[PDB]
């Protein structure tokens, strides 16, 4: 019967909630009391990338820590060179409505998607020297909000149809579909080992997925509104979420709880992007206050601020080697902070 | 070095293509279209010429791009901000929906649902300045419907006859009263005319007005 299972279901939430309190031995704020602080983190705009004629919504570094991609509503996908600020490629898109980007780990491919419900994959290394579109993954029914390549053949995408999918680029069919989200999925982050990925949705929850099985291992709650960005801790045993509650939270996969919340009474706008430092000591979060904060990720003390954009900071990524942090914004400018 | 130089030359050639494309996109006119499922937005689109559908048409040497975003069926709170800076928001409402009710909801009128969507759009933080063209379609079917059915079914309070001229006018004024940004945006309401093909001309006139009165803003002559 409905009521049997429902009253049963709300009981299963109890053992989950019951055990989580029992494993809440001590607050991270108590454990990290004696770590000497990080000190003022002064970061200045080193490079400023100009050439976009609309708001930027997405950017992704390369594994080589030098090239990067950006997309905007102008319907152009540009591969930048961060060292020399010169454009390597400008990809015209068929659909001006792009909301995400990904640069393949090998650097051979780049993917973008948005309200057109399609994840288009563009081939960079091409005999005829003109980035050509390779495959169009059309199996979603809502706007794509994120996409992250695993290999040059596997790409995982998250959409507004409340589902994530893992694709096979050669065939163009969904190898697996991840369902379980009760709200619109906003962002996904792949683990360092590329075996797991967490997704954040508009239903104020984040779910840890297994890419192989296609089942959700754990689900984390604690936020009060939409989760707009998500990223793992470098060691893959933790991740952090940015929501419209203007709080960032650090969840643990082993302990299955929440560790920190990075709130300041001064901050009232919604987080648009989050990203970590190579050492995991800094949590950089791009807010809608038009600025971007840098949190001490083990003390929860806002040490540092990167205020340089006119409009909201849409995307924010750090390099693999951690030499730089680049932020995009709706003011049409990407700034490389070091 | 030499290769670096040729790289810069490449990057400049790239950019001069980004501007040339930027200046081609700026000439195009971006209309966002919204409304109910049966509004007649489908019928409006046909007169003018899954995911987000685009229609391109040219009228009197002006280029229009109409973004029928009716197929998204997701949370508008996350992707509506993508269209901030459209010239206009066309809004279609079917006048023949005053006595009905949606097949999905229990007893909320289709016309009352149209207002609820209009209230959230005209007062959306992303379209504080954006002008709204409001098309009211199916005016002839509304004439037949009103002649025999009362208007009290939708608006409980109404001082006025069951005459098309007055019946319609109550609705038009009722829709125009939704906006609290009376001093910022202009709602150009039109009654759909099938044969005249003036629905497209009214869009031309309403667009120029939003352009002319914007041009006078940035040069300070206003």
């Amino acid at each position, epitope marked *: 019967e409905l009521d049997q299972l429902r009253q049963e279901a709300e009981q299963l939430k109890n053992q989950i909630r019951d055990a989580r309190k029992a494993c809440a031995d001590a607050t991270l704020s108590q454990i990290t009391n004696n770590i000497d602080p990080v000190g003022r983190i002064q970061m200045r705009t080193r490079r400023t990338l100009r050439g976009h004629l609309a708001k930027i919504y997405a950017m992704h570094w390369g594994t080589d820590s030098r090239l990067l991609v950006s997309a905007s509503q102008d319907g152009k996908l540009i591969i930048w060179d961060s060292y020399t600020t010169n454009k390597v490629h400008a990809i015209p898109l068929r659909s001006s409505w792009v909301m995400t980007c990904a640069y393949a780990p090998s650097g051979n491919y780049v993917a973008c998607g948005g309200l057109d419900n399609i994840c288009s994959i563009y081939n960079l290394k091409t*005999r005829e*020297g003109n980035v050509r579109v390779s495959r169009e993954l059309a199996g979603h029914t809502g706007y794509l909000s994120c996409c992250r390549f695993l290999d040059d053949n596997q790409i995982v995408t998250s959409s507004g149809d409340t589902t994530c999918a893992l694709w096979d680029i050669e065939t163009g069919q969904q190898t697996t579909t991840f369902t379980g989200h009760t709200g619109d999925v906003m962002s996904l982050s792949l683990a360092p080992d590329t075996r797991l990925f967490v997704s954040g949705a508009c239903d104020a929850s984040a779910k840890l997925w297994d890419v192989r099985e296609g089942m959700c291992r754990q689900t984390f709650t604690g936020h009060e509104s939409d989760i707009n960005a998500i990223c793992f801790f470098p060691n893959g045993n933790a991740f952090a979420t940015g929501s419209d509650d203007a709080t960032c939270r650090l969840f643990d996969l082993r302990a299955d709880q929440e560790l920190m919340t990075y709130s300041h009474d001064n901050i009232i706008c919604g987080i648009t992007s989050v990203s970590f430092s190579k050492s995991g000591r800094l949590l950089l979060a791009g807010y809608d206050d038009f600025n971007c904060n840098v949190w001490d990720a083990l003390k929860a003390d806002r040490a540092g601020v990167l205020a340089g954009h006119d409009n909201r900071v849409s995307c924010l990524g750090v390099t693999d080697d951690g030499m730089a942090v680049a932020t995009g914004s709706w003011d049409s400018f990407l700034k490389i902070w070091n | 070095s*030499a290769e*670096d130089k*040729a*790289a810069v*030359e490449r990057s400049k050639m790239i950019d001069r293509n980004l501007r040339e494309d930027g200046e081609k996109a700026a000439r195009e006119v971006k209309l966002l279209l919204l409304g109910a499922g049966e509004s007649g937005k489908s019928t409006i689109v046909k007169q003018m010429k899954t995911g987000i559908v685009e229609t391109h048409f040219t009228f009197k040497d002006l280029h229009f791009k109409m973004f029928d975003v009716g197929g998204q069926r997701s949370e508008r709170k996350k992707w509506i901000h993508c269209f901030e800076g459209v010239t206009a928001i066309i809004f279609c409402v079917a006048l023949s929906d005053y006595d009905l009710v949606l097949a999905e909801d229990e007893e909320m009128n289709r016309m009352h649902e149209s207002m609820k969507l209009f209230d959230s759009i005209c007062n959306n933080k992303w379209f504080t300045d954006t002008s709204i063209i409001l098309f009211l379609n199916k005016k002839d079917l509304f004439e037949e419907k009103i002649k025999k059915s009362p208007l009290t079914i939708c608006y409980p309070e109404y001082a006025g006859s069951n005459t098309y001229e007055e019946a319609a006018a109550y609705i038009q004024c009722q829709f125009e009263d939704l906006n609290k940004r009376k001093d910022t945006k202009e709602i150009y309401t039109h009654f759909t005319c099938a044969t005249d093909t003036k629905n497209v001309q009214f869009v031309f006139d309403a667009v120029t007005d939003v352009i002319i009165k914007n041009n006078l803003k940035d040069c300070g002559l206003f």
Partner: single-chain antibody
Amino acid sequence: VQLVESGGGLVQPGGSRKLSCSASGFAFSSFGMHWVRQAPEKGLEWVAYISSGSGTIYYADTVKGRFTISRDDPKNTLFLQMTSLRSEDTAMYYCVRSIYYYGSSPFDFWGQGTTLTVSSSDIVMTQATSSVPVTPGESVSISCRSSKSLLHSNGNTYLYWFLQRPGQSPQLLIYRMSNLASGVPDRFSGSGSGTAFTLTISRLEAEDVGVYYCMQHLEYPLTFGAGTKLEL
């Protein structure tokens, strides 16, 4: 992706002839083209270059102000206008394409070239090996020497390598030291620093017998090296 050139043949000295190279099957408009000539018995020698959209035209010392190089992007053709031909302009004129952007492989594709026979400050690259005998299945190293440190500040040692099999157009093997071209087996490798350069082949075959060349790209006018023929 073929490149074919038209013209050549026999001309009395002082005459003016035109060479046209019709690109087909790639984005010609976005490729920087060169021209490289090879004498009837001697090695390669750079002559001209045009950047993308005719933004930058360079020339060699021996042809400066004597040759005019032009492109027709709409028709995907490349032109060379030659004036007052001298006896030392007898060579096979290859047409090469190259694109310069971070991580690209310039001089990757070479045309078949045309034969032209007239009737009758520079980096200098030296490789002092010729007609080296080698047997298939053994390991061979080819050494090259420069007069100047090719290692630029940014870390790019603008030294290239090429292989010209008997009766074929030259083929890129290494586009910068410690880099490997497209379509070339893993056997070829190159390691060097500053002015000393080497090309190591682990195991070879009868397919890769022929003459090897070295080129620098640190600065124009892109002087090449002498040949290094593998003997078998």
